[PDB]
Amino acid sequence: AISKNLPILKNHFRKHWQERVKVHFDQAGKKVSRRNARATRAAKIAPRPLDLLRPVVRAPTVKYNRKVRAGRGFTLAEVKAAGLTAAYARTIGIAVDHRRQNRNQEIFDANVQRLKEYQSKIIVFPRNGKAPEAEQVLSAAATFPIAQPATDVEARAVQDNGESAFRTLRLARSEKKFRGIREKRAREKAEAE
Amino acid sequence: TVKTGIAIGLNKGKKVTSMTPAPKISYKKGAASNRTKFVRSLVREIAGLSPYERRLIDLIRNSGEKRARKVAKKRLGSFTRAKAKVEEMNNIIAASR
Amino acid sequence: PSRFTKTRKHRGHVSAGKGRIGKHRKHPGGRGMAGGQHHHRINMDKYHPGYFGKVGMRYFHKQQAHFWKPVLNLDKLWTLIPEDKRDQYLKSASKETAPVIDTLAAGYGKILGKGRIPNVPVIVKARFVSKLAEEKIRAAGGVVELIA
RNA sequence: UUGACCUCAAAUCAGGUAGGAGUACCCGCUGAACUUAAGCAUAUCAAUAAGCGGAGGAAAAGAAACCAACCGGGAUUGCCUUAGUAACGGCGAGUGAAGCGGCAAAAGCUCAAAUUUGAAAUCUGGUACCUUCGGUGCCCGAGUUGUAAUUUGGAGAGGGCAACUUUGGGGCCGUUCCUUGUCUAUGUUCCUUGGAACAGGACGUCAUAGAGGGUGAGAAUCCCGUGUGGCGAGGAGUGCGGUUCUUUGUAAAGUGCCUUCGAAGAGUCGAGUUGUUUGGGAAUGCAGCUCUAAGUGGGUGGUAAAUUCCAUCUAAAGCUAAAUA
RNA sequence: AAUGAAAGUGAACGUAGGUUGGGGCCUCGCAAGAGGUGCACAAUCGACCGAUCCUGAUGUCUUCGGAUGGAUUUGAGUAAG
RNA sequence: UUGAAGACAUUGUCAGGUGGGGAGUUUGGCUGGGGCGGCACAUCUGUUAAACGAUAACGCAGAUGUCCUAAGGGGGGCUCA
Numbered sequence: 001a002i003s004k005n006l007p008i009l010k011n012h013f014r015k016h017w018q019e020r021v022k023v024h025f026d027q028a029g030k031k032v033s034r035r036n037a038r039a040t041r042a043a044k045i046a047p048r049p050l051d052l053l054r055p056v057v058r059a060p061t062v063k064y065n066r067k068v069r070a071g072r073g074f075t076l077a078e079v080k081a082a083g084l085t086a087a088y089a090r091t092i093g094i095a096v097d098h099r100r101q102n103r104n105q106e107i108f109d110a111n112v113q114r115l116k117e118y119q120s121k122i123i124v125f126p127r128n129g130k131a132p133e134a135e136q137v138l139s140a141a142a143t144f145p146i147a148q149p150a151t152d153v154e155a156r157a158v159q160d161n162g163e164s165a166f167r168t169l170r171l172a173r174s175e176k177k178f179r180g181i182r183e184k185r186a187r188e189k190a191e192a193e
Numbered sequence: 194t195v196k197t198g199i200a201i202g203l204n205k206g207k208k209v210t211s212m213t214p215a216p217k218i219s220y221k222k223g224a225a226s227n228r229t230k231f232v233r234s235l236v237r238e239i240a241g242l243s244p245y246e247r248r249l250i251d252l253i254r255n256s257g258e259k260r261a262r263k264v265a266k267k268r269l270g271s272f273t274r275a276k277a278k279v280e281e282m283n284n285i286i287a288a289s290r
Numbered sequence: 291p292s293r294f295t296k297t298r299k300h301r302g303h304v305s306a307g308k309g310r311i312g313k314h315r316k317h318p319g320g321r322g323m324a325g326g327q328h329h330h331r332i333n334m335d336k337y338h339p340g341y342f343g344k345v346g347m348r349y350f351h352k353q354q355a356h357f358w359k360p361v362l363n364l365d366k367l368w369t370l371i372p373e374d375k376r377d378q379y380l381k382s383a384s385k386e387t388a389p390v391i392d393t394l395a396a397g398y399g400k401i402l403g404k405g406r407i408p409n410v411p412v413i414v415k416a417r418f419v420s421k422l423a424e425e426k427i428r429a430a431g432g433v434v435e436l437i438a
Numbered sequence: 439u440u441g442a443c444c445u446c447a448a449a450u451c452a453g454g455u456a457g458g459a460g461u462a463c464c465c466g467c468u469g470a471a472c473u474u475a476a477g478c479a480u481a482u483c484a485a486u487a488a489g490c491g492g493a494g495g496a497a498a499a500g501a502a503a504c505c506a507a508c509c510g511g512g513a514u515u516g517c518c519u520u521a522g523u524a525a526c527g528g529c530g531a532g533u534g535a536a537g538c539g540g541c542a543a544a545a546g547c548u549c550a551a552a553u554u555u556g557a558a559a560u561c562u563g564g565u566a567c568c569u570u571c572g573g574u575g576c577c578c579g580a581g582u583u584g585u586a587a588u589u590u591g592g593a594g595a596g597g598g599c600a601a602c603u604u605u606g607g608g609g610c611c612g613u614u615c616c617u618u619g620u621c622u623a624u625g626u627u628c629c630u631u632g633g634a635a636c637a638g639g640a641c642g643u644c645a646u647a648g649a650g651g652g653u654g655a656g657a658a659u660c661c662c663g664u665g666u667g668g669c670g671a672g673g674a675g676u677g678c679g680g681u682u683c684u685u686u687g688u689a690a691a692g693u694g695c696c697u698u699c700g701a702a703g704a705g706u707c708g709a710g711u712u713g714u715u716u717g718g719g720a721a722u723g724c725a726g727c728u729c730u731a732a733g734u735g736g737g738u739g740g741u742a743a744a745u746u747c748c749a750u751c752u753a754a755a756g757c758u759a760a761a762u763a
Numbered sequence: 764a765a766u767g768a769a770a771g772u773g774a775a776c777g778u779a780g781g782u783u784g785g786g787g788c789c790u791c792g793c794a795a796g797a798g799g800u801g802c803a804c805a806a807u808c809g810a811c812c813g814a815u816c817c818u819g820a821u822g823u824c825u826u827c828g829g830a831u832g833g834a835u836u837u838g839a840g841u842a843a844g
Numbered sequence: 845u846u847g848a849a850g851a852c853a854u855u856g857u858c859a860g861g862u863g864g865g866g867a868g869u870u871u872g873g874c875u876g877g878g879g880c881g882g883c884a885c886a887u888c889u890g891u892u893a894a895a896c897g898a899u900a901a902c903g904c905a906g907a908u909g910u911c912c913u914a915a916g917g918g919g920g921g922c923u924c925a
């Protein structure tokens with residue numbers, strides 16, 4: 001069972017795997033159903049859009065923190081800053097999230113902007129009569145798209161202070177590596193008095 | 194903190210304009226109220242000490258806090274809990290005198 | 291498809307191409323990687339040296355995102371300016387309006403130094419840089435701005 | 439002696455409820471060996487088959503004692519990825535997840551711990567009446583060893599001050615949704631063969647209908663249907679569009695400022711040890727036994743320990759559509 | 764984009780090198796040839812990146828930093844994809 | 845209710861012993877069949893071996909699992925049966 005110059009393989013089929021094969025023949029059918037359900041939901045809910053308004057947030061980790069994306073819901077602070085209560089906002093198509101905190105003014109200010117633009121571009125019918133024919137827009141996400149913020153300009157003046165980014169990186173790496181030993185030395189020194 | 198704006202070293206990371214969010218009341222979980230302070234005092238008076246606590250007060254009296262902590266650790270599991278427990282028994286000893 | 295297989299051409303030849311003497315039996319040799327230190331040692335030593343035994347240190351709960359640092363050589367670099375704007379910036383080589391190249395936005399974590407850039411100042415934003423990459427950018431009148 | 443109370447009984451007492459079936463999928467328990475390792479015991483097959491208990495149209499899970507270490511994300515589930523990877527492993531054979539990212543679907547919340555104390559404000563039953571999936575009187579009873587209102591950590595409560603905003607519940611008629619009924623084109627014209635024309639040839643016709651089936655052989659045009667559109671009947675349900683009756687408001691809710699407070703689940707958590715299990719490695723989860731906490735506490739932060747910080751949630755109580763099977 | 768167990772570091776001395784071959788093309792020859800240029804590919808000597816072992820400059824949280832230069836060492840590398 | 849018994853015993857969890865009563869499994873190879881014997885199973889010298897190298901048999905005659913701070917290294921003087 002080993003022979004020739006071939007890769008070593010790792011095909012995990014030593015259990016009763018044929019009992020649990022899922023072939024997705026319903027791919028096309030599930031797509032028609034999903035679409036019918038969007039249509040059915042849209043009719044039941046009309047003229048409301050099929051989605052709640054969602055905030056912008058920074059993705060976590062060094063790998064994706066360069067991006068912004070839609071988050072779960074607005075903070076209580078952002079909703080208050082936009083001149084709104086959480087209880088009301090939930091009923092007017094805004095997702096609210098009690099867990100997320102604001103620790104960054106840029107993302108906070110941008111989210112407050114989203115809520116203001118939204119309250120401008122909706123019409124809440126009164127809870128009695130009069131109800132004017134509005135016409136249904138299905139996507140809040142398409143109406144209020146998430147823009148990636150701009151970092152810099154296209155071009156500008158070169159400013160060289162002669163420091164060396166490479167040396168800056170090495171020194172920073174070293175300062176971290178010896179912080180602790182250098183604290184111990186500047187205790188064991190200062191103690192003996 | 195204040196991040197340095199580079200990708201390594203002590204306070205690595207992007208500098209952004211900070212906010213300071215309002216304190217979540219959940220963070221005061223198990224802070225002593227006046228009600229619980231009072232009830233806990235009363236029930237100690239009624240109920241008194243458990244056998245291991247009595248062994249601990251005797252051991253502080255004779256063999257000192259070092260040996261007490263060693264026993265409290267065995268009895269409670271943690272050293273953090275044993276330190277706290279021997280502290281509590283020191284205050285019971287000090288209140289009687 | 292079945293019509294082009296040798297199964298079709300073996301129809302009528304007794305042994306189906308597996309021999310009269312040796313035959314096609316079930317698992318002579320054992321299943322899978324059986325015998326790697328015994329009767330399959332020669333294969334393993336010849337084509338997979340290093341297969342048995344341990345080297346190096348374990349790391350529990352390793353998250354690959356921690357190690358994300360895709361590399362870009364200077365060779366490329368000008369590829370990050372769009373092709374429309376590239377030709378103007380190359381002919382108008384100016385310390386006053388050097389293009390900014392955000393290499394993180396482009397999806398890179400470190401500028402390495404392979405090859406040669408045009409003698410045209412550029413501002414390069416990066417998380418990391420090699421020593422030689424920095425020298426080559428500065429020798430073209432550029433700068434490396436470190437970012438996070 | 440008479441009457442309570444507590445606890446425990448009896449009745450063919452009044453009214454109910456469980457069992458058994460099915461069992462594809464779902465929630466648990468219990469639990470193999472064949473097999474692989476070219477032998478075999480750990481391992482693998484498999485946390486599978488068989489056995490047992492329990493559900494529904496879905497179940498389960500679920501609004502963080504979460505992930506992280508970022509410029510941070512934000513209930514659960516599922517798909518694409520992560521990845522045949524980190525890790526486990528007679529480090530052999532073999533095994534093997536998670537975080538982030540893209541998507542489908544999206545929905546949030548409830549108790550306990552509080553003096554109504556100027557009024558147990560609460561609720562089952564019986565009984566009479568009524569407009570009966572229920573309502574109103576009246577009467578026993580339950581209940582202070584605590585039933586309502588009020589609050590659930592995102593908070594919130596008690597005082598004090600100042601302001602403006604917003605509301606309920608019926609029928610009736612359309613639409614909706616399901617179940618049904620009915621009506622809605624055009625050759626059976628001639629010749630040949632044949633028992634039979636639905637075959638061949640000729641000349642037409644309808645076509646939003648030339649799907650399919652039947653009829654004495656290959657039939658759009660003989661019949662039923664098909665296509666298009668119309669007209670009925672019967673429910674279900676306010677989902678929501680109109681109309682009509684009653685306007686709940688001395689009520690209810692929301693909001694700013696000041697001030698005093700801020701109750702938050704124990705034989706649990708955690709620890710040791712034993713067994714089992716996991717990719718989880720000085721111990722991933724589960725369980726037995728022993729030990730057994732705290733309140734600026736407690737849990738987690740994937741290498742044991744002490745010391746010092748920091749970050750992040752808020753366990754030991756509970757409900758919840760959809761995407762999935 | 765490699766390399767290293769890892770922290771990490773990370774690919775032009777030069778016409779992206781020299782030498783020997785090398786199809787085809789170019790020039791001169793009636794032609795034989797002679798000369799030039801030589802892609803792929805082959806052999807060989809170098810250079811470059813990482814590991815290992817040495818060396819240890821200017822500097823300086825006086826123990827950090829690690830220039831420069833080496834080595835019968837090593838890599839599943841670079842050297843117009 | 846009446847005797848006994850009494851914080852002992854019993855029961856629970858862990859620990860040491862005992863435990864073919866029972867469970868699971870194993871119990872090399874070569875070989876003039878197999879077994880007994882031997883090792884021709886890792887090896888070394890001479891021969892077989894056919895004057896390069898290779899070369900079989902449970903062919904022939906033997907050896908190995910050690911021994912040595914000198915019995916290793918260098919130099920000097922000397923010469924053995």
Ligand SMILES: [K+]
Pocket residue numbers: 306307308
């Ligand atoms: K063959």
Ligand SMILES: [K+]
Pocket residue numbers: none
């Ligand atoms: K009954």
Ligand SMILES: [K+]
Pocket residue numbers: 535716717
């Ligand atoms: K697992």
Ligand SMILES: [K+]
Pocket residue numbers: 721
């Ligand atoms: K365990």
Ligand SMILES: [K+]
Pocket residue numbers: none
């Ligand atoms: K957070």
Ligand SMILES: [K+]
Pocket residue numbers: none
């Ligand atoms: K903490």
Ligand SMILES: [K+]
Pocket residue numbers: 852853
């Ligand atoms: K006893």
Ligand SMILES: [K+]
Pocket residue numbers: none
């Ligand atoms: K025993």
Ligand SMILES: [K+]
Pocket residue numbers: 863864
């Ligand atoms: K036995």
Ligand SMILES: [K+]
Pocket residue numbers: none
């Ligand atoms: K024999």
Ligand SMILES: [Mg+2]
Pocket residue numbers: 303
């Ligand atoms: Mg043949």
Ligand SMILES: [Mg+2]
Pocket residue numbers: 304305309310313
């Ligand atoms: Mg055969």
Ligand SMILES: [Mg+2]
Pocket residue numbers: 312313318
């Ligand atoms: Mg074979």
Ligand SMILES: [Mg+2]
Pocket residue numbers: 451
């Ligand atoms: Mg009865």
Ligand SMILES: [Mg+2]
Pocket residue numbers: 473
């Ligand atoms: Mg099988």
Ligand SMILES: [Mg+2]
Pocket residue numbers: 475
């Ligand atoms: Mg086997």
